[PDB]
Design a protein around this ligand. Sequence first.
Ligand SMILES: Nc1ncnc2c1ncn2[C@H]1C[C@H](O)[C@@H](COP(=O)(O)OP(=O)(O)OP(=O)(O)O)O1
Ligand SMILES: Nc1ncnc2c1ncn2[C@H]1C[C@H](O)[C@@H](COP(=O)(O)OP(=O)(O)OP(=O)(O)O)O1
Lengths: 790, 790
Amino acid sequence: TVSDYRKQLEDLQSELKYMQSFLKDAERQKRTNETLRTLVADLRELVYEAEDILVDCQLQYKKSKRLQEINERITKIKSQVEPYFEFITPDRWSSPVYDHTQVVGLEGDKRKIKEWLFRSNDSQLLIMAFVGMGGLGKTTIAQEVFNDKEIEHRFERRIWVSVSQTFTEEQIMRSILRNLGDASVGDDIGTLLRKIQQYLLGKRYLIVMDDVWDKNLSWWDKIYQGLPRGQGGSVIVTTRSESVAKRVQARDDKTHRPELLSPDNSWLLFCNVAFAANDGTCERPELEDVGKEIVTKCKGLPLTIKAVGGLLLCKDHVYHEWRRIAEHFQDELRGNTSETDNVMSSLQLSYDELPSHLKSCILTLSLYPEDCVIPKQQLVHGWIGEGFVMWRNGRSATESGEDCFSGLTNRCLIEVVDKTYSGTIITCKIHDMVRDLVIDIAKKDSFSNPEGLNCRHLGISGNFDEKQIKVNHKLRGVVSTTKTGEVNKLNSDLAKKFTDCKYLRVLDISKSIFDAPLSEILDEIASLQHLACLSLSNTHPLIQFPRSMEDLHNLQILDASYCQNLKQLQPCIVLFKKLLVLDMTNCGSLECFPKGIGSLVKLEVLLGFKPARSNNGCKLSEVKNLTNLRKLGLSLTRGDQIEEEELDSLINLSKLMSISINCYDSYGDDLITKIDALTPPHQLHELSLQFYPGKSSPSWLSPHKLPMLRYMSICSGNLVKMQEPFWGNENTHWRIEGLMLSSLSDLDMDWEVLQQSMPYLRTVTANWCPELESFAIEDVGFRGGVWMKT
Amino acid sequence: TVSDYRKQLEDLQSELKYMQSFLKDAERQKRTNETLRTLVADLRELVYEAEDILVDCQLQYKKSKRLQEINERITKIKSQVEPYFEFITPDRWSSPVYDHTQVVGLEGDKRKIKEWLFRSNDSQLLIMAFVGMGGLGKTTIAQEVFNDKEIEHRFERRIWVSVSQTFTEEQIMRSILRNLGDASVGDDIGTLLRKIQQYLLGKRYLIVMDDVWDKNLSWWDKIYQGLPRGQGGSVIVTTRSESVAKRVQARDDKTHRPELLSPDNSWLLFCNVAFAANDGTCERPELEDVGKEIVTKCKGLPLTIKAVGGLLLCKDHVYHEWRRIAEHFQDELRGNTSETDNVMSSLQLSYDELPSHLKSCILTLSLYPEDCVIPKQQLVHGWIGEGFVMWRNGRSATESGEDCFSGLTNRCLIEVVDKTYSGTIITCKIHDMVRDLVIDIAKKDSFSNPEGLNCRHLGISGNFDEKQIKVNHKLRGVVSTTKTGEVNKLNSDLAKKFTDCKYLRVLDISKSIFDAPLSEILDEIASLQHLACLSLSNTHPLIQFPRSMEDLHNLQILDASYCQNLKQLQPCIVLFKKLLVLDMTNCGSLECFPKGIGSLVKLEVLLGFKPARSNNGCKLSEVKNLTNLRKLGLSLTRGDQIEEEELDSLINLSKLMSISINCYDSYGDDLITKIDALTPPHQLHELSLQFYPGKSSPSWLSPHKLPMLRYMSICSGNLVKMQEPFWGNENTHWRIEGLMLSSLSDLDMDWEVLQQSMPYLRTVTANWCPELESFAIEDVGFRGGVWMKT
Ligand SMILES: Nc1ncnc2c1ncn2[C@H]1C[C@H](O)[C@@H](COP(=O)(O)OP(=O)(O)OP(=O)(O)O)O1
Ligand SMILES: Nc1ncnc2c1ncn2[C@H]1C[C@H](O)[C@@H](COP(=O)(O)OP(=O)(O)OP(=O)(O)O)O1
C-alpha cells in the first residue's frame, strides 16, 4: 500500500490525461443522446476531483488511500456505464423570402445601405459586413435591402448564399451556380470556379453571404479571386463577428451594426405577433400593463419578442398566465415551448464555436448581478489567476488577457461600455439572454451552482453581513461582484471561513468593509498554498497585510489599488520570484517600497513605483534589471526621489509600452530640473504625465527622442508652453494619433501649427483649457469636444 | 516467478509484434481525434521501452520482474483507454482561376515555358514536368502559362485536372470529359476512355495535371495510350518529385524547377499582401526594418510570406506585435492562426507519404543547427548504424543508404549543396520550414526532445566544455553536429557519461578536442554492448583507441578518417566478422594494418588499405577473399608494399565498383614498375589515381582491360604522356562519360583525338594544366572550365 504509491500515482496522471482529452472530443460530437450527456456531466466533476487531489503529490499512506479510492471510483463508473453504449446502435438555413409586413421600422438603415450600394462603381469590388449578436436583425435587413425594386434596377443578378456553421466549399459554389440560373450539374470544384467566373462577365452582380463564421474561412480567398472586379459588383457578408469582418476586410466604415429596438417599436412588434387575430391590435386593456412589462423586460432583441409572442399565441389571453410569465420568464424560454422555437439553441451555437479556454473564460460571467457594469481588469486578472490562460511564446500575462478579452468581444458576446482616448477598454457588460445562457451552462458541471452544495467558485453580492453564504471546501475562486457603487458589507466569520478553503486560487475583494483589521483576519493564509491572485482593493480596515505571507510561493499577481492606508510593504514580496503584476495605484500613505524589487524578474506591470530616497526602499537602479515589463507607473513627490546616474534608467527597457507619471504631491523645482533627464525608450506607445509641476515641456518630448509615439494624454499641470524641440518640424514629425489635454489653465499653443506638426491625428479630446480658443472643437474652455476628422 | 520466465518473455515478443503493427495502421487513418493521437503518442514510447528491455534476454529473476511490470503496464493502459473508444461513435483542390496582380515577376520562366510549348509539333507528345518543394510556385506558373492569350491561340482545348493525393481513376477521367465540354454522364471506365479518345481527333490539346504523387501511379499508363499522338498535344505535370518526373519520363531537360524569391521580389510581395489597404504600399516607416527582417527571415517561399501577410493583416499595425513576431516566428505558423491557412499541413502532407523507414530517416534531421551544410556520409552511416535500414537481397549496406538518401532527395525534402564530377553527392542541406516541421514531429515521441528529460538520442553543438548537457540512460545515439568549421570543445566528464549509456547504437564524434587521451577516456566501452558505429574522425588526443574492444561483437562499421596520429590498429578488429565499412582515409602515421583483414568477409568499403611489407601487417593476398566489397582505396609508399604473385589480386572481385589509388608519399621507380601489373576487373565504374609518380600511363588504362569505365579522374602527378594502348582506336572506344584532370604540369595530349577516342563524353573538368592550350574550355591552365556539351 506504500511501495506502490508512485505507481498508483502515475496511472492517475495517465488517466486524467486521457479523460480530459475525451472531454475535448465529446463536445465536438453532434447527436448527443442522454447517456452521453450524463456521463460527460459527471466526468467533468470527476476531472475536477482528480486534478484537485493530484496537487497533493507535491504520511505517504493517506494519500495512497485517496489515490486508491478515486481510481476505484473511476474504473467502477467506466465499467458501470459501458454496456449502455454497447446496447443502442447510433439544420439551419436562410432565404430571401420574408413577409415585409411585420418588419418594424428600418427605413433609415435601409436608406443608408442603399446609398452605400449606389456607390459600388467607386471601388473595384465593394464588400460590406453586417456585424451583430445572434438574433438582431441582420438577415432581415439584408432581405429588406435586396428585395427592394431599385436594387433590382441596379443589380441584374442577385444571389443569396446560405453558409451555415457546417458546410463545404462544393455546395456553396454550386448554390452560387443554382442562383445564377445554370442547372445543377454534378461536377467538380475547379470547373465550378470556371463556370462562376464565366457567368459574371459585364454583369453588375450582388451576392449576399449569410451566417459566415470563422471556421475554415480560407474558402473565401479561394473564391475571392474568382469574382470579376471593376464591374461594380457588391458582396454583403452578414455575420456574428468583427474578426471575420477584418478577415474579409470590408472596411472600418462599411460595417453596419443593427441596434436594439426602441420600446415603442418593440411594443408594436409584440402587438403584431401576439394579438395576430384582430389585425395585430390589443383588444382588452387589462393585459397592456403586464404586456408592456414583458416587452420592456425582453430588452430589444426581436428574437425573444417573437418567441414570447409565439408562446403567448397558444393561450386563452386571461390575466393569470400573462402575469406569471411576467414574473417567471427565463424558465419557459429554456423549455422552448418543449423545443419548437429555440432561442437558446441560436445563442448556444454561438457559444459552441469558442475554443475551450475561451469557453472557460466566457463561463465566469454567470457570476455577476443583473445589469452590472463589469470592469475588464478584474476579469483579466481572474483569468490569469486561476489558469484559463496559458502562455509560452512571450505573450505571457497581460497581452494574453487582452487578446482573450478581444476574442470574446469579437464574437459579439461581451459588449463594451466606455472606451478611453487610446482605444483601450475599461468596462464591459453583456446582454441578459447571453447571461442566463451562461447561467444554464453553469447549471451543468459545478462551475457555478449558486444554490445548494457543490460549487467550484463563488461570487458575493452586496451586504452579506447577516445572510451567511454557504461555503464548502472546494471553492477554487471567491470574487466580489458589485453593481457600480455598492459595498459588500461583510462580517468576520465569512472571511475566516475563506481561509479554510484548501484549494482557492482566486481571492479578490473589491468593495468590502470588514469589522476587524485584515492583519489578524487573514492571519492563517499560510493554510492557503495554491493562491494565485489577490486584489485587496478598496477595503476600510486594511492597514497592514498579514505577516504570514512567506509560504505563498505561487502568488502570480498582487493587487492593492486605491487603498489610501498601506504603510509598510513587507520584505516577503521579494523572494518568491514568480510575480506578474504588482499594482499600487494612488495608494497615498505608503513607504514607497521594499528593497529587492529588481530581484524578481518575470513581472510585466509595475504601477505606482514611488522611487525611494538614499537609505530607503529601492531606487530606480534595479529598474534596468526588469527586462520584461511593459506597463510602468511612476509617482514623484520631491527632488531626492531620484538619483543622478540613475537618470538613464529607462533606455534599456526593450519591451516597454506605456509610462504613467503622477507628479501629484510635488514639492520643489529640483524635481522639475531632475525630471528632464529621464528619457523613455525609443519605442513607447502611450505616455500620460498628469500633474507635472513644470512650466515648459520636459525637453525630451520630441519626435527625435521617441519616434513611435501614437497615443498621449496630458492631465492637470502648471505647464505654460512647449519648447522648440516639441515641434521639430524640419523633416521629422510625431506620427501621433490620439491626443488628450484634460485640465490646463496655463497651456497655450496653436491649431494649424499642430496640424502641420502632427500629420496623423484622428481625435484630439480637450475639455478644460480656458485659454486656447483656436481649436476646431466646439469649446476648448468649459466643455469638451473630440474633433473627429474625416 | 522463475519457471514462467520463458512464457512471460514470449508474450511480450508477441505483444510488441502486434502493437507496432498497430503503429503501422493508425498513421494511415484519417480523422484522428484527440484520444487516438494521445494513445499513439504514448504507445510509441512504450514500444521504445519494450524493445529496449527486450534485448536483455540474450539472475533470471530481476529480468522476470522487468517483464512482469511492463506487461502489467501495457495491459493496464489498454484496459484504461478502451472504454473511451467504446463511448464515442465515429479537401485539397486547384483551379485555373487566379488573380494575376500579386504574381511577382515570373516573365523569364513564363517566356521559357512558352517557347517550350511552341515546339510541340517537333515531338509526338510533348510532356513536361514542374518539380519543386511544397508551396514554391508550380501551380501559379502553370496558371500563368496557359491563361495567356497566345496559348489559347495555339491550343484550342485547355484542360485542368486536379489530381489530389487521394483520388480515383474514375473522377480523373470524368473531370477530363467535363473539361472537354461533354456532359457529366454517369458511366463506367472503358466507355470514358473511348469518349476521351474520340473527342481528341485533330485537336491540338493541352492538359495540365496538378499535384501528381507517386502513389498507385499506374493510372498514368492506363491513360497515356489513350491520348492521340502526332497532333502536337502537350501535357504539363506539376508535382513534388523527380521520381514521378522519370516515371512519366518527361525528359531530363524539359523539367522546370522554380526558384526561391529574391529579397526585392519577396519584399514587394509582402507589401502587396500585408499592406493591402493603401494599394499595397507601406504607409509608416517605423515598420520597414522589422518588416524587412521578417521577409528576409522567411527565406524565399511565397507560401510562408503570404501566411505571414495574412497573419499581420488582422492586427493594428503598431510596432510591438510586429517586433515580437520578428523574434517569435515559428510558434505562430504552427498555430496557423488557429488552423486557417495551414503551411504546416501543406508540408506535413509531403511528410505523410513517405515509407516508415524513410519517415525515420527524415526524422533525424531535426538534430542539426540553423543552416549547417550536412555531409551525406555521416547521415548514411547513422542510418546504417542504429537500424533504419534493412537489407536482404544484396543491397546490403552502402547502396541501401544511397537509395534511401536519393529517395529523400527525390521527394524534394533534402536539397543538395555540391556535387562532384561523377554525379555523386557529398553535402546536403534542408529548407528551414522543413526543419522545424521535423522538429515539431520530433516534439512528439521522444526521438528528439531537446529540452527536458526524455530523449532517445542527442546531438551536440559547438563548445560544450562548460554547459553540461543533460544525459539520461536511454540515449540510442549521440551525434556531433558542427556548422562547417567549428570544433566541439568537450571536457572529460561528458565523454565518461557517454559510456554510462547501456543502449547506445550510434556514437560519432566528428569535430572535437578533448582534455585527456581517448585511450583512457573510452576505456569502459566494454559496458557498451550494442554499439553499431564509431566515426572517431578529427579528434586531437586520439593516438591509440582503447584496448577494451574485444567484447564489441556487433560493431557494424568503424570509421576513423583524417586522424593523422593512429599508430597501431589492434588485432581485435579481425575476429568479430560482422563489419561493413572500415574507413581510414588519409591517416598518415599508421602501421598499415593488422593481419586477418581477409578473415572477416561481409564488408563493403575498405579505404586506405596501405598493403604491408613481408613480415608486417597484411598483404594484398587476402583481398581475393573479400568477395563482397565495392569501394576500395589503395595508398602506396614504396616498392615492397606489394608482392609479385599478388599482382593479379584484383581480377576476382566480382562486385567491385570503384578504386582510389593514393601514391602520395612515393619513393622509387620500383613502385612505378610494380604498379603496372595491378589489373582492375573488367567491370569498374570509377577510378581515381591521384598522385601517381610514373611518367607514362599505367599500361592497363585501355578499353581492352576495362571496357565499362564511365567516370575517371586524374589529380596531381608526374605523368608526361599517355601510351599507345590508351587510345586503342581500331574499333574499341572508352564509353567514358566524365573526366577530370586536376593539377598536371607535365601532361600533354590533344582535344580532337580525345573526341575521336571518347565518343560518349559529356563534361571534362580540367583546372590546372598549363601546357595543353588546345581544349574547348576557357583556360586549361590557371582557371578551369567544364565543357558542358550539347
Ligand atoms: N426589424 C425587425 N422587425 C421585425 N422582426 C424582426 C426585425 N429584425 C429581426 N426580426 C425578427 C425576424 C426573425 O423572426 C428574428 C431573427 O432575425 P434574423 O435576421 O434571423 O437575426 P440576425 O440575422 O440578426 O441573427 P442570426 O445571424 O442569428 O440570424 O427577428
Ligand atoms: N510568383 C508568385 N507571386 C506571388 N504569389 C506566389 C508566387 N508563387 C507562388 N505564390 C503563392 C500562391 C499561393 O498563395 C502560394 C502557393 O503557391 P502554389 O503555386 O500553389 O504552390 P506550388 O504549386 O509551388 O506547390 P503545391 O502545389 O504543392 O502547393 O504561393
